[PDB]
Amino acid sequence: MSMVYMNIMMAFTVSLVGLLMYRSHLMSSLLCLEGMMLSLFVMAALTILNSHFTLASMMPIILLVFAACEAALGLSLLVMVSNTYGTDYVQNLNLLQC
Amino acid sequence: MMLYIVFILSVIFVMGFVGFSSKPSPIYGGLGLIVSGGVGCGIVLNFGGSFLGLMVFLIYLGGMMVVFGYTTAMATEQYPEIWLSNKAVLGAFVTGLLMEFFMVYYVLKDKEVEVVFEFNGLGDWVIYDTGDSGFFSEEAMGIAALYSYGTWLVIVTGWSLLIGVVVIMEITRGN
Amino acid sequence: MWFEVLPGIAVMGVCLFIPGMATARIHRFSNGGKEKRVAHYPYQWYLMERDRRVSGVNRSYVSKGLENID
Amino acid sequence: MFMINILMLIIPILLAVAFLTLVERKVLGYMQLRKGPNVVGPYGLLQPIADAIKLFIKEPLRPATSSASMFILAPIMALGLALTMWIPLPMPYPLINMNLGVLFMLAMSSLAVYSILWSGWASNSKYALIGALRAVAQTISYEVTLAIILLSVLLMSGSFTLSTLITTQEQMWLILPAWPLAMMWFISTLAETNRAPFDLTEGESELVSGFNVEYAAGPFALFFMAEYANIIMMNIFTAILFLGTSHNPHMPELYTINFTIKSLLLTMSFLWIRASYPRFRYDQLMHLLWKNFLPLTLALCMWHVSLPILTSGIPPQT
Amino acid sequence: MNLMLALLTNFTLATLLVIIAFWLPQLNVYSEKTSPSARLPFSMKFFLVAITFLLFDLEIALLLPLPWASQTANLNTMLTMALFLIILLAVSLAYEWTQKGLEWTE
Amino acid sequence: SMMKWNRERRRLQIEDFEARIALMPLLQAEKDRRVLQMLRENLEEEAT
Amino acid sequence: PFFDVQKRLGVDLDRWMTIQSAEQPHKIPSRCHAFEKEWIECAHGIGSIRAEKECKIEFEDFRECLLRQKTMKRLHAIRRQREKLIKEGKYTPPPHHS
Amino acid sequence: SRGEYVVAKLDDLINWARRSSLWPMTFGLACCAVEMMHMAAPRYDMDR
Amino acid sequence: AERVAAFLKNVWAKEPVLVASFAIAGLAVILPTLSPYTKYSLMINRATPYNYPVPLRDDGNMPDVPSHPQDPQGPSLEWLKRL
Amino acid sequence: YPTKETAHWKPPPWNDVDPPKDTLVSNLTLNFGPQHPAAHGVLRLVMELSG
Amino acid sequence: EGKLVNQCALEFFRQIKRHCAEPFTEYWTCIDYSGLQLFRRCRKQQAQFDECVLDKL
Numbered sequence A: 001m002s003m004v005y006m007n008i009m010m011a012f013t014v015s016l017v018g019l020l021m022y023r024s025h026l027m028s029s030l031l032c033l034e035g036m037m038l039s040l041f042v043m044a045a046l047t048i049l050n051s052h053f054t055l056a057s058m059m060p061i062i063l064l065v066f067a068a069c070e071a072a073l074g075l076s077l078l079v080m081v082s083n084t085y086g087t088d089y090v091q092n093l094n095l096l097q098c
Numbered sequence B: 001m002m003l004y005i006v007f008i009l010s011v012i013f014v015m016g017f018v019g020f021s022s023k024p025s026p027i028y029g030g031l032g033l034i035v036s037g038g039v040g041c042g043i044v045l046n047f048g049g050s051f052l053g054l055m056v057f058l059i060y061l062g063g064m065m066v067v068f069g070y071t072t073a074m075a076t077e078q079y080p081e082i083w084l085s086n087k088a089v090l091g092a093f094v095t096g097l098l099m100e101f102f103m104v105y106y107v108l109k110d111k112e113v114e115v116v117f118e119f120n121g122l123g124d125w126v127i128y129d130t131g132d133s134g135f136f137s138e139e140a141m142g143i144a145a146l147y148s149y150g151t152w153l154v155i156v157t158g159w160s161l162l163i164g165v166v167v168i169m170e171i172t173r174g175n
Numbered sequence C: 001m002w003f004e005v006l007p008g009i010a011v012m013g014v015c016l017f018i019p020g021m022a023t024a025r026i027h028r029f030s031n032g033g034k035e036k037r038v039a040h041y042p043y044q045w046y047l048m049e050r051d052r053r054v055s056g057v058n059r060s061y062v063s064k065g066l067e068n069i070d
Numbered sequence D: 001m002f003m004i005n006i007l008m009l010i011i012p013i014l015l016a017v018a019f020l021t022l023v024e025r026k027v028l029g030y031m032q033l034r035k036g037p038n039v040v041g042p043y044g045l046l047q048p049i050a051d052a053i054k055l056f057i058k059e060p061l062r063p064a065t066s067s068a069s070m071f072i073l074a075p076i077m078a079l080g081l082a083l084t085m086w087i088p089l090p091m092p093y094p095l096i097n098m099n100l101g102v103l104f105m106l107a108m109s110s111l112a113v114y115s116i117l118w119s120g121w122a123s124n125s126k127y128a129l130i131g132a133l134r135a136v137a138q139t140i141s142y143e144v145t146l147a148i149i150l151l152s153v154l155l156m157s158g159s160f161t162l163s164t165l166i167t168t169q170e171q172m173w174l175i176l177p178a179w180p181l182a183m184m185w186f187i188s189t190l191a192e193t194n195r196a197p198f199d200l201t202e203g204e205s206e207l208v209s210g211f212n213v214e215y216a217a218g219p220f221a222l223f224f225m226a227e228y229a230n231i232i233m234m235n236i237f238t239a240i241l242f243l244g245t246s247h248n249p250h251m252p253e254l255y256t257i258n259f260t261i262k263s264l265l266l267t268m269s270f271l272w273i274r275a276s277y278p279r280f281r282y283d284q285l286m287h288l289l290w291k292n293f294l295p296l297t298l299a300l301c302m303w304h305v306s307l308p309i310l311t312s313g314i315p316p317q318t
Numbered sequence E: 001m002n003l004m005l006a007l008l009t010n011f012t013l014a015t016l017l018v019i020i021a022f023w024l025p026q027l028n029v030y031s032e033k034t035s036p037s038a039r040l041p042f043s044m045k046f047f048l049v050a051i052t053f054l055l056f057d058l059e060i061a062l063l064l065p066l067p068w069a070s071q072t073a074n075l076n077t078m079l080t081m082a083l084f085l086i087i088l089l090a091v092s093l094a095y096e097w098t099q100k101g102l103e104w105t106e
Numbered sequence F: 001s002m003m004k005w006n007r008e009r010r011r012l013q014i015e016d017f018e019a020r021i022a023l024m025p026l027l028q029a030e031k032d033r034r035v036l037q038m039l040r041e042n043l044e045e046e047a048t
Numbered sequence G: 001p002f003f004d005v006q007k008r009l010g011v012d013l014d015r016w017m018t019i020q021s022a023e024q025p026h027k028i029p030s031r032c033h034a035f036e037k038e039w040i041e042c043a044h045g046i047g048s049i050r051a052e053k054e055c056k057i058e059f060e061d062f063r064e065c066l067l068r069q070k071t072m073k074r075l076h077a078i079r080r081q082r083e084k085l086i087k088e089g090k091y092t093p094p095p096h097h098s
Numbered sequence H: 001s002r003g004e005y006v007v008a009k010l011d012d013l014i015n016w017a018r019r020s021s022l023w024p025m026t027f028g029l030a031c032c033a034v035e036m037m038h039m040a041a042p043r044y045d046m047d048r
Numbered sequence I: 001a002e003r004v005a006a007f008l009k010n011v012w013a014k015e016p017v018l019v020a021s022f023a024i025a026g027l028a029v030i031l032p033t034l035s036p037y038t039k040y041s042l043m044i045n046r047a048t049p050y051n052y053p054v055p056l057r058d059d060g061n062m063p064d065v066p067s068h069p070q071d072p073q074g075p076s077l078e079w080l081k082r083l
Numbered sequence J: 001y002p003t004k005e006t007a008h009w010k011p012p013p014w015n016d017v018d019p020p021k022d023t024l025v026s027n028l029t030l031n032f033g034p035q036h037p038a039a040h041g042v043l044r045l046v047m048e049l050s051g
Numbered sequence K: 001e002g003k004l005v006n007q008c009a010l011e012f013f014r015q016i017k018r019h020c021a022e023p024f025t026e027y028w029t030c031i032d033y034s035g036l037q038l039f040r041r042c043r044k045q046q047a048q049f050d051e052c053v054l055d056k057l
């Protein structure tokens, strides 16, 4: 494959590792989730644009819209967590251990 | 060097990702993503995606990321720890840039590297199309077709956005 | 009186007038006294590239007419 | 040659902003039965220069910032984006001729909200941050109508090219077919730029409005220049959008003169409005957007999608 | 190239003005002074206006192609789906309005 | 007024698009020769 | 599809965007239209088990058009060889090519 | 071109700017604030 | 009726902005189906030639296909010139 | 099967509700003065706000 | 067939250079001024060129 794909695929891999390796802030992990979508948007757009797949030009928009809507849902849950505990730390979300 | 604009931008793209993926304070995490998004739009522009590129700025940066920063201020951070002042954050950041540097080193030197997939390092320009003389933008024509070809897509996408409004009001009411 | 407000408005007017006047004049200076060519679509760019080749001096704004026909 | 063109845009922009501060004080002065600056230079023509020198040699404020990087980034972003908004404007020819110039201007303005957010974050003050968040909520709310109104007008223009708005209005100003959209557009630009009666950042209802309160801020001059550059730019955009000037290719200067007058008059109307009305409450300007402008803007968007089709007046694509 | 030069010039000047705005006062050498996360508490209403902006802003993304969409031969389909989108945007507002999602009273 | 002007602009667009159509055969013939010459030239350097 | 409602009702919900050689706005063709057409027609009706063997030639050409992996390998060999000779002064670029 | 001359003219410039652009913070505590408000009012127009 | 007219009076007095919004939207949804010039929008969009008109191989029996662009046969744009 | 690593575990609430004891402090207290001291100047308003 | 396209074009322009050069030169010089090369800016010179070719060719 072309050289650009190497970096876009690295970016997805980096943000995926960032997503799976939490620290404390739930917010910092949501950003990694949005980073994953951004790299998917770019890789999809590059593949579609370069190949002149005309009708697929709308696909990156649908990706962005649905992922932003899912990000709104994630942010809403974070706010409800912050209301319960006063922080978005993931270590407070361990009640269901038992 | 301008003939490798796409590759240079994609290197900056990865560096920004290593930025927020090492997960500094959320305030600076949003900054890394904003820069990555802006660079990401730049890459899409250089493939002929002018409308798609500007959507990133309008919707991803001017919309989604504004709301992230808005929420971060209210619910998460008000002041940040100094970037790269933490052991794990700095170690993760150093590790990412070393991996990126070596990928870039071998791809440029051997003109090819191989990790899961085979990548060629001749230059992204070599794959471009050599025939263009229509009186319109193909990208714009494809996006405009959403309303003629994509009736079903509009319905489900429209329904999901409406349900999003309903769901988020349900979630946040608290009773 | 109210017309003593005009001198400051005149200064504003001259400042806002300059960018538009400069761009028009610089465009005609750089494109042989003609408007800078607009190429929003590949077809227009294709013809501009062809003119650059046809000119013989590597400038798309140098026009060759029937004098080149033979 | 292009580098000259850039400087012949940037420098006059900064000078217009400087002397708009004088015009505002004198226009507001005469509407208040007084004069305004007329001592520092003849007719106060040196007053902008005295203010500029004074501000730049003033001591920097205290307290210290919470984030040095965000403290420095906010003014750079505000001023960098403000100047960038001018590069596609056709006056009558643009510095950068974009096929999607209207979308570029929407996209760049939506990024201007970051300087508000970052300066609130860097203020090291809980109350100053809350003030910034109220300002952001106002800005993004009125961005919704600007985008939808803009989309409605372009259905008569046919493209996103700014210079195509000139061709669209060759026979007639778009304000005639679209005066209801022009009304809401003009108010949205006031609310978007935090101008009276929507200037709640400078109002009496903020948690930080108290005179004796302090928080990290500045430089004042750079933020002020960015704001006033946007006032002029929005009014230039308003003129192009609704009061299109005829362009003669052989006499472009005539376009520029007529186009400059219309922009000046619209800018003066911002000053006119500031002199005339009290200030909105925060909940009331939210109500104005969400419960008045937005329902009517959605309806007019439906109308302007349908109207060209049912009249057989769809504009060309190129 | 030109657009890159313009963006570089605009943000370069903005940067120089910012640093000299921060250095020029140090010429005065003013005297030393020697005299001076979590919820905010954040209101749910301010969060909900931001979220509503986002969801409305996503629906605007779908409406932006309308000027091009009107050039199609299938105008009846295009007009039906265009009005469908705007109406669902209105229905989102109506739902928010009638559940007091647009109120500022506590 | 907008309807009349946009109808005239549509007629003007058709005129511009038809000028292109009249010229496309000449442009196509040139492009084919240019492409084939460049490929032939690349081949000669490949042999060397 | 798991439930082929589209075929039963004869309604096209999403087939229109599944391949790049389907009808496009203004008849804009994708770059690999001919290759995809040939592979689809070769493999049509015979099932995927047979197609993986009997349409290998078509699929290999289609994949080469998509990602150009072999074209780039051949270009890289020529360019590598060329710069080797320019280093050794045993080759000179012609007037064109400069 | 002595340093005394340049320093002298630079003093005049910064002094001119500072006195020509005096921004007051009025601490209106009692009656005197009313007269301060009459200094801003049209007859005297301190803004001028 | 008269109950209906009274209701329209109460909203026109209390919510003129919403009355105007629903009226404008209602016209947007109704007038296109009633307009006689809607058909011309479709015709004009189909008269715009974005692509080259590829010629047909003349087998010898296509009477209604012109051999030259200025021959009488083929679709005319006479209706558009007058419109 | 109790172990040393689950000794601290306790059965969940009968109705799944855990008491809200973490952070609930939403009333701002604002020392309020006038935006401009030209007229009032000597007003101090200790206000407690809720949004 | 591509070569015959060129030869027909060359003979077409030789006809204009033979009978209608001056009206044609005026017409395309106006077209060339416009950044978009607009037909509608040059209807007066177009009419002069159209009249010439109708009479002489």
Ligand SMILES: CCCCCCCCCCCCO[C@@H]1O[C@H](CO)[C@@H](O[C@H]2O[C@H](CO)[C@@H](O)[C@H](O)[C@H]2O)[C@H](O)[C@H]1O
Binding pocket: D014, D015, D017, D018, D021, D024, D025, D048, D051, D052, D202, D221, D224, D225
């Ligand atoms: C080359 C150009 C260099 C840049 C030069 C910039 C010069 C700036 C001169 C400003 C002249 C004074 O202009 C005036 O300033 C004050 C700020 O104190 C503003 O005052 C406004 O903002 C402040 C807060 O920021 C509020 O307390 C005040 O109630 C409100 O009215 C006025 O709205 C403005 O009209």
